[PDB]
C-alpha cells in the first residue's frame, strides 16, 4: 500500500505528464524499443520502423502512446482502488497480446527514465520511490489477474 503522501507525489508528477501526453508517450515507447528491442516484436503494428526519426514521425505510435498513458493515468488516479480499470487490461494483455510481466517491468523502467529526463526537479528520490511503488503495485495486481485467467507470464 502506498501512503497518502506517496500517492500525492505520483499524482504531482503525473500532472506534468498530462501537459503533453503524446510527447511523453512517444519518448516512453521509443525508450522501451531502444532498451529492449524484443518488445517491438510483440507490437506487430509499427514493428517495421527502422530509425528514431521514423518512430517520432509515426502517427500510429504516437496515438498508441496516448492510449497507454491514458489507461495507466486512470489506474494511478484510483490510488490502488483500480480493479475495474485493471481487469480489462489484464484480459487483453494476458489472452490476446500475451505480454509477460517482464515486459511490464521494461516499460516501467522506460516510464521512470522519461519522467526523470523531463522533470528532474519534480522527480527526485522520494518521487522516484513513490512512482516505483505505484508501478510495482500495478504489476503485482496485473500478474494476479493474469493467473486468474490462466496465463502464467
Ligand atoms: C503500462 C503498461 C501498459 C498499458 C497501460 C497498456 C495499455 C494498453 C491499452 C489501453 C491498449 C488498448 C486496449 C487493449 O487492447 O487492452 C493496449 C493495447 C496493446 N498493448 Fe498494451 N499496455 C501496456 C503495456 C504493454 C507492453 C509492454 C506491450 C508490448 C511489449 C503491450 C502491447 C500491446 C499491444 C500489442 C496492443 C494492441 C494494440 C493494437 O493492435 O492496436 N502493452 N495496451
93 annotated ligand-binding residue: yes
Structure-determination approach: X-ray
For residue 137, which of 92, 79, 91 has the smallest C-alpha distance?
79
DSSP string, 27-69: HHHHHHHHH-THHHHT--TTTT--SHHHHHH-HHHHHHHHHHH
- Looking from the CA of residue 44, the nearest atom of ligand 1 is 35
Instruction: Please tell me the CATH code under which domain 1-153 is placed.
Output: 1.10.490.10
Residue 47: all three cell numbers together: 514493428
Residue 81: all three cell numbers together: 482502488
Q: Dihedral sign, CA of 63, 68, 73, 74?
A: positive
What is the structure's resolution, reported in angstroms to one decimal? 1.7
113 annotated ligand-binding residue: no
Cβ–ligand 1 contact at 102 (below 6 Å): no
Amino acid at each position: 500500500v502506498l501512503s497518502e503522501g506517496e500517492w500525492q507525489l505520483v499524482l504531482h508528477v503525473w500532472a506534468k505528464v498530462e501537459a503533453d501526453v503524446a510527447g511523453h508517450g512517444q519518448d516512453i515507447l521509443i525508450r522501451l524499443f531502444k532498451s529492449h528491442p524484443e518488445t517491438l516484436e510483440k507490437y506487430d503494428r509499427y514493428k517495421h520502423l527502422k530509425t528514431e526519426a521514423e518512430m517520432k514521425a509515426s502517427e500510429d505510435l504516437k496515438k498508441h502512446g496516448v492510449t497507454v498513458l491514458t489507461a495507466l493515468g486512470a489506474i494511478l488516479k484510483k490510488k490502488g482502488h483500480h480493479e475495474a480499470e485493471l481487469k480489462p487490461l489484464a484480459q487483453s494483455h494476458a489472452t490476446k497480446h500475451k505480454i509477460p510481466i517482464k515486459y511490464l517491468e521494461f516499460i516501467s523502467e522506460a516510464i521512470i527514465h522519461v519522467l526523470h529526463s523531463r522533470h528532474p526537479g519534480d522527480f527526485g528520490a522520494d518521487a522516484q520511490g513513490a512512482m516505483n511503488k505505484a508501478l510495482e503495485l500495478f504489476r503485482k495486481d496485473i500478474a494476479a489477474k493474469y493467473k486468474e485467467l490462466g496465463y502464467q507470464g
